[PDB]
């Protein structure tokens, strides 16, 4: 009776979502052409909507002002799955101009998208929430992604938000103008979303390299692991389990403060079959594996600062007694410390369905694993690094004009560093003892 | 869908044009007759960008060939690939330019501007959403620089929003093909600063140096120089016609290549190049590609990027390569070449990914970078005028068009400080 | 004593289809997906949530 | 800008190389009646202010010697850039004191 | 009510002294002008800054320091320095002509015309003090002006005040690389006057600093300032207990009675570690023995000398922070047990332990920095007499040819005095050889 509508925007968002849906699609036995072979079960409703004749139309929205990436899907094998008129594609791209994607070229399409999303909610009634994926270091996503973010808050209001962002790579970047469009995107999403994540692409490579030992990976595989991240997220929503964690039970157990809604997530284990033969893959050992910063999904070391929250969703064949026995072990180590006022911040959930592997995947088949979304003051560094960048290219007014001529006023830029400056102090003030 | 147009003028501007359509016709799998015979279904999806639909299933380029002398346009159509261009789109008079920048802008070239402005407007109106104009011409020639620029100047008064390109072959002092080579280019150059959004400077010396040194060729012919310049053209819009992991239209490059509103003069380079006798003896892969592309000598500008510091740079890798390797080489090149990716804009290199390799090669890249090293070219090349101006004359061949002195003393007043704009944004620091 | 045999030497692989125990269970790329077994939330009472009888309460 | 331009005022001076058909540049100085001709395009010229031969430095050792050179450590937000070296100044493990117990004990 | 007066003569002291005071004012929260900001937490807690400063009654603070140098350029820099108001303008006595590394000028020809103002200066400075523990003198032996001003000045305080304890942190020339070419002469004669008129001598040869610098500091391009931020932090813990609470008080006075077994043997060397910095700060822990073990490491001494070549007579160590000393005995317990570390037969115990509570503070950020550990020794080893050999042999290497002889003879210093320095210096080795001989 629970469904979630997904919003995938930005070249990554549709591409990053590209990999994830198959895992959503494959795990329910639905064929690529929208049919299931004759065989709880068949309650795909958690992501899909049965017409009544067999077809399963996902409740996802595709937006991009640039037809190219969009064109890759309707010409692909998955052409017959998605609803045809539900794929909104723009004519002229934003070309990485946040103002362009947020002031001039996106407004004329907002009504159509806002129209489509509203429709998809009519069929369902117990909608848990929405998942929106947008890359901060992207032009079209930065603006369009924000604008949709702003509207729903007045379109629905109180309804929660669960958005998966991908901040710029800590050191090896693709574009050059990312710091500008990155900050403003944060400003809009800073106080118009409920839960965020740290999806720096540098994290996957080392995880893909250290674990998968693939020194020449591409962007397609990176999404695969990210797709795995989501799968464990809704694991308790369409599978029987003794302890279940739902989206509506997120602000209660992961939001120490209304402002602070930016944490980092991770999953384990990333192991190919070639090394898992000589491995025990014991629940206890996997427990520490997702805590070492080497396996984290963000280029931040939690040893820099304290820990504010840690929520665990166990998926596979683990047993509660070992988890508590394993959970206690973490409270002994002195390399990782909590905050003075965080007596209880652990959340352990057990679901009976172990991971499912799509054909052609890199991860091998195992018996246990873990995914994590933890609250630690370590988030300070990532923004701090941006803070240094933001001023560097504005103290000489570099690239300012390109933004000014598309309708963005000059006074908008300052607040972004103003809001960010306040944000940094917000995290620091919640890391000291009383 | 977001198609573009091309306006190439002047004999120099025409000859480069003669091959680009030769180059483009291959990529989309089109032979001279105008019929489709391609191989891959992706070959044809994005074909509308450069051609218009026509009766009989045949395609014609959206090109306007503009010249003031009769021989050139008479030359092209009778040669191979002579059928593609629409006969109507041609325009020419009965006078000629004669590398007199004066005659090409007031007396003769002025009177005919009606037709070219007549034809250009119509074709642009046809396209669903005009992406922009790319103008190719030789400022060292008469019609290109003289009359060609005005069309660049005029078109701004009608289409303020679209973006411009210029593959201008600025002549170099080492080997000058004309004594006027250094009263037609700049006077077209001066008008170029206030209207041209971007500028590509291709120096002849680079071509001959490029051909002799790496290609190891013995007796090249202009057919050799033309194609290498043309290959660069396919790189600019290459990602605009085929799908890829990371796409970037000609707009996206414009954002990440010009540090300040007016400093819009770049230098480009094409890699990889190897001789016929050397192909087998080289292992071609991603990491040695960077060695060639970032080498200064590979640049098509006579300026040496080792004379200054790079402001911003972009590269479009051609050939199917993963995402990891592309980024990492950037990190090392930035750190290792930090001294130049100067210091007040971190990571000034942009990245692009496309998955269609040039036919017959498995890895190649296209380079479009901004570096103060262009300052030398606007300092030395014909720097003699500053001393040679003092004696006031050659005038009698240019006042024949009403041009006065004030039009010249004013330009440096408007023109004095390009480097004095470029120089300042080379020592500044936070 | 001659070198034993070139054909019996350490070969980075041999002719045994699945040369190792590794790939015996590697998933087939083209295999059709299999519907999951009886492992999910058992469903009776929320039946009375999507029915068209809830509205018109008064 | 900078760039170049033409000269364009011919029937002006020198009274002899005027309209002497010969590509002879503009006209002939003859102010002194001696050598160098006018050295078609330039450079927007320069003044002593433009080229001042910037000094290698502007300050002395002590200013940097006693610069006002916060204490960086694990996290603590900003970290000033410095040359890379793997034998380690501020990314490695610390050692925390073994200090005393006060009073007569 | 305890006050200490630091005397600086010579540029090396002019610069090295700078690092300590700058850190001090940074340790005590003193602004460059000397004005204490009231906005800081609390303020005026007892008298902690009284050790080095002197209150004017209302406003700034006056550190008890004196600057001396014969060449204006060094002096002129301080007066125009950013801390041009931190020092008393009348305390910056400056001459007219440098000594240029010659003893006879700064001690017999031009150095005698300057001792008047300074000596009067301290008297006024000493008048303010009521519990003066002593005086601190910083200067480099590698110069005639230093040794010339050090030699002539120091003796005066011996008679002017008498029993007042005086500490001298000399900086001897390096074994192989020396700034000047006449380094041995000034050092050879310099030890003479200070031979019977200096209380403590801390062997701090520079090159050993780089070796530690080249092994832990890891700054391939260090400047003197890199050296300065090393020594300056050293003094902070040395007198640490003199300005902060400690379990077992360690004062300036109870050192000579702990580091002077014989009247002539008063040369000492010290060790301290670890270092704080910019590519080793995973800050995370380690333990004490590491700090103690590195303390006794042959390469960790502030001298290019190996205690493996000698025996240990007495020791003193200093910590800071807040833990239970109990590790000290065991941490020391692992020290003597080491066979590489030995004591003399007549030394039942040779360790002096003094620990304070105040942690280490660093300028932002230093060259050292806010270290977590702080272990420093005040101990003596016979090996330093050898590596006297370097000075002794080379000094012999010259006089045989009488090289550069006339320079000192041009100031009225007789040709015969050269003999005495060899005599007394030669006699210096005898006791050390006899001091280490077992009964
Ligand atoms: N991790 C990851 N990031 C991706 C992937 N594809 C794209 N990105 C992100 O996309 C950024 C590059 O900019 P674009 O993808 O062109 O941004 P955009 O979505 O096109 O936004 P617009 O330019 O306005 O159209 C990179 O910095 C990446 O962070 C991917 O496959 N994996
Ligand atoms: N380690 C270190 N030594 C210094 C520093 N500044 C000066 N010195 C010492 O000063 C010595 C140079 O001797 P001189 O230049 O003659 O100085 P001087 O002894 O006062 O003699 P004059 O300069 O003539 O007044 C060097 O050998 C150093 O040991 C410093 O910043 N660090
Ligand atoms: N690279 C290259 N340069 C050319 C070509 N054709 C002409 N040029 C250059 O153009 C210059 C002369 O231009 P010009 O004939 O005055 O142009 P026009 O007045 O339009 O005919 C010469 O210096 C050549 O270097 C060509 O096909 N390739
Ligand atoms: Mg895009
Ligand atoms: Mg001196």
Automatic annotation (TrEMBL), chain C:
It comes from the Eukaryota. This is Uncharacterized protein. It comes from Tetrahymena thermophila (strain SB210).
Automatic annotation (TrEMBL), chain D:
The chain holds residues 19 to 123 of 175 of the full protein. This is Uncharacterized protein. The lineage of its organism: Eukaryota, Sar, Alveolata, Ciliophora, Intramacronucleata.
């Amino acid at each position: 009776m629970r469904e979630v509508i997904s919003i995938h925007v930005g070249q990554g968002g549709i591409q990053v979502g590209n990999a994830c849906w198959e895992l959503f699609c494959l795990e329910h036995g639905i064929q690529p052409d929208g049919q299931m072979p004759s065989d709880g079960d068949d309650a795909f409703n958690t992501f899909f909507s049965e017409t009544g004749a067999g077809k399963h139309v996902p409740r996802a929205v595709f937006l991009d002002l640039e037809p190219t990436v969009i064109d890759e899907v309707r010409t692909g094998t998955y052409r017959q799955l998605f609803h045809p008129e539900q794929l909104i594609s723009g004519k002229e791209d934003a070309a990485n101009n946040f103002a362009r994607g947020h002031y001039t070229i996106g407004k004329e399409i907002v009504d159509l998208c806002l129209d489509r999303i509203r429709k998809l909610a009519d069929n369902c009634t117990g909608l848990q929430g929405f998942l929106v994926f947008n890359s901060v270091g992207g032009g079209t996503g930065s603006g369009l992604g924000s604008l949709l973010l702003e509207r729903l808050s007045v379109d629905y209001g109180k309804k929660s938000k669960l958005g998966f962002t991908i901040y710029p790579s800590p050191q090896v970047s693709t574009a050059v103008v990312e710091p500008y469009n990155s900050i403003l995107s944060t400003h809009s999403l800073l106080e118009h979303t409920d839960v965020a994540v740290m999806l720096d692409n540098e994290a996957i490579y080392d995880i893909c390299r250290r674990n998968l030992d693939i020194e020449r990976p591409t962007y397609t595989n990176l999404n695969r692991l990210i797709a795995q991240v989501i799968s464990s997220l809704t694991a308790s929503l369409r599978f029987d389990g003794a302890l279940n964690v739902d989206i509506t039970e997120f602000q209660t157990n992961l939001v120490p403060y209304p402002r602070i809604h930016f944490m980092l997530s991770s999953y384990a284990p990333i192991i190919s079959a070639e090394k898992a033969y000589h491995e025990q893959l014991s629940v206890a050992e996997i427990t520490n594996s997702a805590f070492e910063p080497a396996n984290m999904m963000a280029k931040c070391d939690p040893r820099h600062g304290k820990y504010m929250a840690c929520s665990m969703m166990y998926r596979g064949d683990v047993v509660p007694k070992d988890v508590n026995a394993s959970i206690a072990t973490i409270k002994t180590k002195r390399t990782i410390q909590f905050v003075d006022w965080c007596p209880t911040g652990f959340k352990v959930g057990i679901n009976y369905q172990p991971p499912t592997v799509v054909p052609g995947g890199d991860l091998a088949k195992v018996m246990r694993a873990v995914c994590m979304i933890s609250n630690s003051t370590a988030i300070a560094e990532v923004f701090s690094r941006l803070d240094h960048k933001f001023d560097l290219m504005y103290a000489k007014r570099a690239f300012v004009h390109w933004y000014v001529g598309e309708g963005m006023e000059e006074g908008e830029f300052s607040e972004a560093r103003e809001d960010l400056a306040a944000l940094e102090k917000d995290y620091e003030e919640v890391g000291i003892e009383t | 869908m977001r198609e573009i147009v091309h306006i190439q003028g002047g004999q120099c501007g025409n000859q480069i044009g003669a091959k680009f359509w030769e180059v483009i016709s291959d990529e989309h799998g089109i032979d001279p007759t105008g019929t489709y015979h391609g191989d891959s279904d992706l070959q044809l999806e994005r074909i509308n960008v450069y051609y218009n639909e026509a009766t009989g299933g045949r395609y014609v380029p959206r090109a306007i060939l503009m010249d003031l002398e009769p021989g050139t346009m008479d030359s092209v159509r009778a040669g191979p690939f002579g059928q593609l261009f629409r006969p109507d789109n041609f325009v020419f008079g009965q006078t000629g330019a004669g590398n007199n920048w004066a005659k090409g802008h007031y007396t003769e070239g002025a009177e005919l501007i009606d037709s070219v402005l007549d034809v250009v407007r119509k074709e642009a109106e046809g396209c669903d959403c005009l992406q922009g104009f790319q103008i190719t011409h030789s400022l060292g020639g008469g019609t290109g620089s003289g009359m060609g620029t005005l069309l660049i100047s005029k078109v701004r008064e009608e289409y303020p929003d679209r973006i411009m390109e210029t593959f201008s072959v600025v002549p170099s002092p080492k080997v000058s093909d004309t004594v006027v080579e250094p009263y037609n280019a700049t006077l077209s150059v001066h008008q170029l600063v206030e209207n041209a959004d971007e500028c590509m400077v291709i120096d002849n010396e680079a071509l001959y140096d490029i051909c002799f040194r790496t290609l190891k060729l013995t007796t090249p012919t202009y057919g050799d120089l033309n194609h290498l310049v043309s290959a660069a053209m396919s790189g600019v819009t290459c990602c605009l016609r085929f799908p890829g992991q990371l796409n970037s239209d000609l707009r996206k490059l414009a954002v990440n290549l010009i540090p300040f509103p007016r400093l819009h003069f770049f230098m480009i380079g094409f890699a990889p190049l190897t001789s016929r006798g050397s192909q087998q003896y080289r292992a071609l892969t991603v990491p040695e590609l960077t060695q060639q592309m970032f080498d200064a000598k590979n640049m098509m500008c006579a300026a040496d990027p080792r004379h200054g510091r790079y402001l911003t740079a972009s590269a479009l890798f051609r050939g199917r390569m993963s995402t990891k390797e592309v980024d990492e080489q950037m990190l090392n090149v930035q750190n290792k070449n930090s001294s130049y990716f100067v210091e007040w804009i971190p990571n000034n290199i942009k990245s692009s990914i496309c998955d269609i390799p040039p036919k017959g090669l498995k890895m190649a890249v296209t380079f479009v970078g901004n570096s103060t090293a262009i300052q030398e070219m606007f300092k030395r090349v014909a720097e003699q005028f500053t001393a040679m101006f003092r004696r006031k004359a050659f005038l009698h061949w240019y006042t024949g068009e009403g041009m006065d002195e004030m039009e010249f003393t004013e330009a440096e007043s408007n023109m004095n400080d390009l480097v004095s704009e470029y120089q300042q944004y080379q020592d500044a620091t936070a | 004593y001659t070198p034993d045999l070139s054909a019996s030497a350490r070969t980075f692989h041999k002719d045994t289809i699945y040369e190792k125990d590794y790939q015996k269970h590697i998933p087939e790329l083209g295999s059709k997906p299999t519907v999951p077994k009886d492992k999910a939330r058992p469903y009776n009472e929320f039946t009375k949530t999507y029915d068209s009888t809830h509205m018109k309460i008064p | 800008r900078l760039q170049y331009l033409g000269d364009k005022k011919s029937q002006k001076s020198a009274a002899f190389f005027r309209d002497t058909r010969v590509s002879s540049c503009s006209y002939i100085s003859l102010k002194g009646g001696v050598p160098r001709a006018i050295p078609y395009y330039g450079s927007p010229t320069k003044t002593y202010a433009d080229t001042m031969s910037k000094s290698s430095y502007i300050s002395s050792l002590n200013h940097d010697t006693y610069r006002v050179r916060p204490y960086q450590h694990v996290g603590m937000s900003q970290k000033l850039l410095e040359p890379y070296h793997p034998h380690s100044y501020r990314n490695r493990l610390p050692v925390p004191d073994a200090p005393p117990q006060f009073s007569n004990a």
